[PDB]
Amino acid sequence: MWQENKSWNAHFTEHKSQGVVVLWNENKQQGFTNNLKRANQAFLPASTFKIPNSLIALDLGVVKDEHQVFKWDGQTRDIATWNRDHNLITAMKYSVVPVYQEFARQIGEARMSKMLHAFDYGNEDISGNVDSFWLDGGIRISATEQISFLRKLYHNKLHVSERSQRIVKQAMLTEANGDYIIRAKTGYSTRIEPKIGWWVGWVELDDNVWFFAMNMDMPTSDGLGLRQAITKEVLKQEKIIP
Amino acid sequence: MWQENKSWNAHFTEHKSQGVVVLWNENKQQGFTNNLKRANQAFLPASTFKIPNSLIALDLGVVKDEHQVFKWDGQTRDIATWNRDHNLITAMKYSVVPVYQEFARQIGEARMSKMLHAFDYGNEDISGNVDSFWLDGGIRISATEQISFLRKLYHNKLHVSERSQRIVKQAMLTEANGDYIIRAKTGYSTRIEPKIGWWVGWVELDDNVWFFAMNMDMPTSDGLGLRQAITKEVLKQEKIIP
Ligand SMILES: O=S(=O)(O)c1ccc2cc(S(=O)(=O)O)ccc2c1
Ligand SMILES: O=S(=O)(O)c1ccc2cc(S(=O)(=O)O)ccc2c1
Ligand SMILES: [Cl-]
Ligand code: NA
Ligand code: NA
Numbered sequence: 028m029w030q031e032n033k034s035w036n037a038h039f040t041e042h043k044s045q046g047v048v049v050l051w052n053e054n055k056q057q058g059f060t061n062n063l064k065r066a067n068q069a070f071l072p073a074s075t076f077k078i079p080n081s082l083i084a085l086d087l088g089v090v091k092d093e094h095q096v097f098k099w100d101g102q103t104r105d106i107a108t109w110n111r112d113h114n115l116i117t118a119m120k121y122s123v124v125p126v127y128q129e130f131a132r133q134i135g136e137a138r139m140s141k142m143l144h145a146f147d148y149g150n151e152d153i154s155g156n157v158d159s160f161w162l163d164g165g166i167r168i169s170a171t172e173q174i175s176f177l178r179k180l181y182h183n184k185l186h187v188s189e190r191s192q193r194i195v196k197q198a199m200l201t202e203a204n205g206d207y208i209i210r211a212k213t214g215y216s217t218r219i220e221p222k223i224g225w226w227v228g229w230v231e232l233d234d235n236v237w238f239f240a241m242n243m244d245m246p247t248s249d250g251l252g253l254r255q256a257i258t259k260e261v262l263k264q265e266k267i268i269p
Numbered sequence: 270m271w272q273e274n275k276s277w278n279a280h281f282t283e284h285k286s287q288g289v290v291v292l293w294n295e296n297k298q299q300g301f302t303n304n305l306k307r308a309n310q311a312f313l314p315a316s317t318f319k320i321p322n323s324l325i326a327l328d329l330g331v332v333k334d335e336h337q338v339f340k341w342d343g344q345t346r347d348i349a350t351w352n353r354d355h356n357l358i359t360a361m362k363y364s365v366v367p368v369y370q371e372f373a374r375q376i377g378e379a380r381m382s383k384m385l386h387a388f389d390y391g392n393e394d395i396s397g398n399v400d401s402f403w404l405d406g407g408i409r410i411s412a413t414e415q416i417s418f419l420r421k422l423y424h425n426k427l428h429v430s431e432r433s434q435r436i437v438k439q440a441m442l443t444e445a446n447g448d449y450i451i452r453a454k455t456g457y458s459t460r461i462e463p464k465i466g467w468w469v470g471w472v473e474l475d476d477n478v479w480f481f482a483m484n485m486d487m488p489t490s491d492g493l494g495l496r497q498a499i500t501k502e503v504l505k506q507e508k509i510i511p
């Protein structure tokens with residue numbers, strides 16, 4: 028099932044960093060990682076929680092579809108792309124936290140807790156603030172647990188409607204060409220140590236899909252590009268993407 | 270509503286050919302083209318008929334989902350990519366006619382003709398074989414008629430389920446990066462003169478979507494890549510993609 032390959036550490040070493048990448052080959056039901064222990068250590072999901080959050084908001088009707096416009100509240104924040112109107116596509120593309128904070132407020136503590144229990148998501152714990160618990164509360168999830176959740180989403184097996192799951196899988200669209208399709212979500216956990224950056228999702232090939240979930244030490248925002256860079260180096264080494 | 274911008278013909282004559290490109294700004298509700306007469310000229314849809322064919326087959330249960338495998342029939346044909354198993358995603362990417370010829374045969378003439386009338390698709394005529402009329406039968410559709418069809422598809426108001434339309438819009442995925450997403454379908458009509466090449470779809474932006482339909486004279490298969498090349502040149506000139 029799980030096989031360890033420490034070859035991939037060089038890609039983390041090359042950039043003064045440490046992390047874990049987890050790959051799952053859907054067809055052959057075989058997994059791969061450079062660090063079995065870290066692959067199963069639970070961290071704050073940060074903005075990768077936007078995947079379950081969107082599924083919940085859509086299923087409950089907080090968000091009717093991917094065209095509904097969530098208008099900027101007018102407060103100028105540090106990330107410039109947040110200071111504009113957004114729909115679910117652009118909101119997820121740019122990790123617009125304010126938009127998902129009002130989602131969490133409408134969902135409320137009870138329904139959020141109930142949904143995460145049914146999702147089997149992480150430790151299912153929403154302790155902390157209603158609109159910030161995935162950034163500084165008690166919820167935790169491992170990279171392998173992200174793959175378990177993601178595999179349910181890919182196969183439309185999560186407890187919410189098939190429509191909700193198809194809309195989110197559309198919003199996760201990051202990259203696509205003649206070779207592959209990447210649906211994925213980035214995350215950056217800055218409020219509680221250890222500061223880490225996430226990239227979870229999958230790579231759709233012609234006749235297979237590879238699920239991946241990576242996290243890495245991230246002391247500042249300047250290294251965020253390595254989340255995608257290091258992952259793609261691993262995908263190139265296994266001849267998944269050219 | 271429409272306006273002619275014959276500046277684009279320099280992108281066609283540069284590659285020794287003729288054609289039309291039709292754009293439609295969804296937000297502004299304004300259309301553009303380099304030749305309004307060819308824009309309204311109706312040709313065989315060729316494999317751009319895979320868009321409505323896929324909707325009909327999905328709505329009728331001929332195709333269960335985007336993951337169902339359709340086994341190669343063993344007959345080795347001239348396009349290598351056709352001689353292997355496929356699903357809806359790859360069968361559309363490689364324009365695998367045999368796979369869609371089976372779809373049509375199971376849909377049948379009666380339901381195909383009622384569905385095309387419900388879609389308002391072209392001249393709604395399926396005269397000829399039910400398994401080849403979009404390649405050598407009587408169906409005819411213009412570039413502007415493709416845009417009307419595609420607009421309904423984008424808005425889920427075609428007369429099939431919302432599920433079927435979302436799946437087809439998924440299978441149309443051609444290209445996606447941080448700047449745009451292209452959902453399109455290629456076509457090469459070579460059984461009845463004039464031999465022409467199609468590219469129809471739309472470009473999803475952050476705050477807008479641009480529908481496009483284009484066709485051009487294609488005497489030999491060598492020039493097929495100019496379908497996308499010329500379209501991207503127009504889109505660049507109109508400050509639609511960088
Ligand atoms: O609220 S914080 O400033 O801690 C915060 C929250 C989410 C973030 C997501 C990203 S992401 O672009 O990596 O998704 C980057 C920085 C972030 C900072
Ligand atoms: O059956 S034909 O050989 O006439 C035929 C049908 C569809 C085709 C689609 C393409 S595509 O470029 O639209 O994928 C290219 C050649 C084709 C030939
Ligand atoms: Cl998609
Ligand atoms: Na997105
Ligand atoms: Na944090």
Ligand code: NA
Nearest residue numbers: 327330332333
């Ligand atoms: Na179906």
Ligand code: NA
Nearest residue numbers: 458461462463
């Ligand atoms: Na023709």
